[PDB]
Amino acid sequence: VLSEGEWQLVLHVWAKVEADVAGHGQDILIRLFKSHPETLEKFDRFKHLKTEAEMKASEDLKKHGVTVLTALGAILKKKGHHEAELKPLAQSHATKHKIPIKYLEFISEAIIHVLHSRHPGDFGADAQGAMNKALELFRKDIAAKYKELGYQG
Ligand code: HEM
């Protein structure tokens, strides 16, 4: 469980992300695809993109980034009380997109990395820690669902 103090650290930096959601989302997905190119194979929509330049130039990829961070922000603001928002996400990701839990770990790291790059002042080690805990909580709850449906592994 995160403390109120840990949640305030998470939401404080998240408020800055919202000042440029598209930029953050585009950096996050690109970091993911480069660092773990198997994740890009899961997107029919983006697998024709080969270079970083190409990825940066894609408006559609930018759009999807926004969809991703908008959905995550709605979850984080619930400070753990996210059942209604996390359940349909788990379902689509398990049964339709077929995204293994390991990939959620990879994107979580991409998120931390980018937040470190863009907000060094408001993202010190305590904030980093807090954010890692919130993302673990997200995964843990997604995994429980996957298991119910028979997709944990
Ligand atoms: C931060 C974690 C993630 C969030 C919050 C998130 C959110 C979303 C949202 C809201 C959608 C559209 C609605 C839906 O189908 O549920 C979407 C679709 C999708 N997601 Fe996730 N996602 C996450 C992680 C991932 C990861 C790691 C991958 C794996 C490569 C992935 C692959 C997909 C795919 C393939 C679609 C459909 C894309 C399309 O063709 O339009 N997602 N995601």
Atom of ligand 1 nearest to the CA of 45: 40
Residues in contact with ligand 1 by the CB-under-6-Å rule are 39, 42-43, 45, 67-68, 71-72, 89, 92-93, 97, 99, 103-104, 107
User: How far is residue 147's CA from residue 142's CA, in Å, rounded to a whole number?
Assistant: 9
Give the range of the structural domain holding residue 7, as residue numbers without chain letter: 1-153
Radius of gyration (C-alpha) of the chain in whole angstroms? 15
Closest alpha carbon to 137 in 87, 93, 70, 80: 80
User: How far is residue 107's CA from residue 87's CA, in Å, rounded to a whole number?
Assistant: 19
Residue 69: partners with Cβ closer than 8 Å, 6 or more residues away: 17, 21, 24, 25, 28
In which region does residue 98 sit, left (phi positive, over 0), alpha (psi from -120 to 50) or beta (all else)? Answer: left
User: How far is residue 146's CA from residue 140's CA, in Å, rounded to a whole number?
Assistant: 10
- The domain that holds 102 is classified in CATH as 1.10.490.10
Q: What is the number of domains present in the chain?
A: 1
User: How far is residue 118's CA from residue 14's CA, in Å, rounded to a whole number?
Assistant: 12
Compute the Cα dihedral for 16, 34, 38, 61 and give only its sign. Answer: positive
Q: Which two tokens stand for residue 45?
A: 């929509």
Closest alpha carbon to 28 in 118, 138, 97, 125: 118
